[PDB]
Amino acid sequence: EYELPEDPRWELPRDRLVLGKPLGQVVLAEAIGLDKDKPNRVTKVAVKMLKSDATEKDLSDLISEMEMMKMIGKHKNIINLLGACTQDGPLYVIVEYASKGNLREYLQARRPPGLEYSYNPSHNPEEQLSSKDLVSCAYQVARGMEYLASKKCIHRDLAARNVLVTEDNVMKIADFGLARDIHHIDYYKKTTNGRLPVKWMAPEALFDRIYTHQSDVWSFGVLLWEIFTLGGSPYPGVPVEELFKLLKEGHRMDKPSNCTNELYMMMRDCWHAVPSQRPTFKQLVEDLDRIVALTS
Ligand SMILES: [Cl-]
Ligand SMILES: [Cl-]
Ligand SMILES: [Cl-]
C-alpha cells in the first residue's frame, strides 16, 4: 500500500457512492450525503480514477490534481472538487458533473442545417444558439480563466474540448489542475480523442516550451475561433510539421464566416506574437462583458 492523504473535510465513504456509467478514467456516479447537512440527497457527480494499467507516477499525478483543486478553490466556471475516496480501495476523486459534455461537441450538435457552417454530425441535433449565447459562452470561459490566473494556475491546454457544459448550460473549465510532466512529452502526439494539442499552443510554448498566463491567453484565442465556428477545426489543411514556421512568419487563421469584426480583433489580439502585448483574462472578461450586453 501507499500513504494516501486522508482529508476529513473532503473524505467520502465509498458506500455513499453509487457507480453509474463511464464518462471518459472518469465515470458518472451518484453520491448520497455530499452535503452532510442534507444526508438524504443524492447528487449526480463525476468520478476521476486510475486506469487498470496505472503506475505510481499516475497515482501521484491524480493526488497532485486533487490537492491542487483544494488550493485553487471554487468558482462557478470551473469543474470543482466535491470529495474523494482514499480509504478501502482505489483512489476516487469526485468532481462536478457536466451532463451536456465538452463544448466542442456541444457546439457541433447545435449547428444549423445550412452550409456556412460545416455539417452537423449529430444524429441528435439540438436547437441552435443565439448570437448572445455564443458571446456569453466565451465570457464564462474567460471568467473561469481569470479566476484560475488569479490563483496562479496555468492550464497549458485550454481548448473547447477541455470546457464542459452543465445541465443548465454553464461553462466549466476542465483538467486545469493536471500536473506538468517532467519529461519531454511529444506534443505532436494525437490525444486519445483524436485532437492535436499543438494547434492550441502559443509559439513560445512550441519553441521553448515556456508556458505562462499569456500562452493560456493565446489558447483562449483559438478557443474563441472554435466557438464562432461552432466547433470548427483549427488551421484547416495545415500540416502540424509546418505550423510553427507559419506562425513565426505571422500566419493567422482567417475570420470565421459568422463573426463580428470586434470579436475577430479580440482573437488576433490573443494571437499577438509578443506575449506581453496579448490582453489579460481580466481585460478579456471586461471587454466580453460589454459585448455580451450589446449583442442581445
Ligand atoms: Cl481531449
Ligand atoms: Cl483537431
Ligand atoms: Cl470543421
Numbering used by the authors: 462 to 485, 491 to 762
What do the study's own words say?
Fibroblast growth factors and their receptors (FGFs and FGFRs) play a critical role in many physiological processes including embryogenesis, wound healing, inflammation and angiogenesis as well as adult tissue homeostasis. Compelling evidence also implicates activation of FGFRs (FGFR1–4) in pathogenesis of several developmental syndromes and a broad range of human malignancies. For the analyses of inhibitor sensitivity, we focused on a structurally well-defined kinase domain (KD) of FGFR1, with the gatekeeper V561M variant and Y563C variant (corresponding to the replacement found in FGFR4) generated in the context of FGFR1. To extend the structural analysis, we solved the structures of the WT FGFR1 KD without and with bound TKI258 and of FGFR1 KD V561M variant with TKI258 at 2.3, 1.96 and 1.96 Å resolution respectively.
The structures of TKI258 bound WT FGFR1 KD and FGFR1 KD V561M superposes on apo WT FGFR1 KD with an overall root mean square deviation (rmsd) value of 1.02 (287 amino acid residues) and 1.01 (286 amino acid residues) Å units, while the drug bound WT FGFR1 KD and FGFR1 KD V561M superpose on each other with an rmsd value of 0.36 Å units (293 amino acid residues). The low rmsd values and illustrated superimposed structures in Fig. 2B suggest that the binding of TKI258 to FGFR1 KD does not alter the enzyme structure.
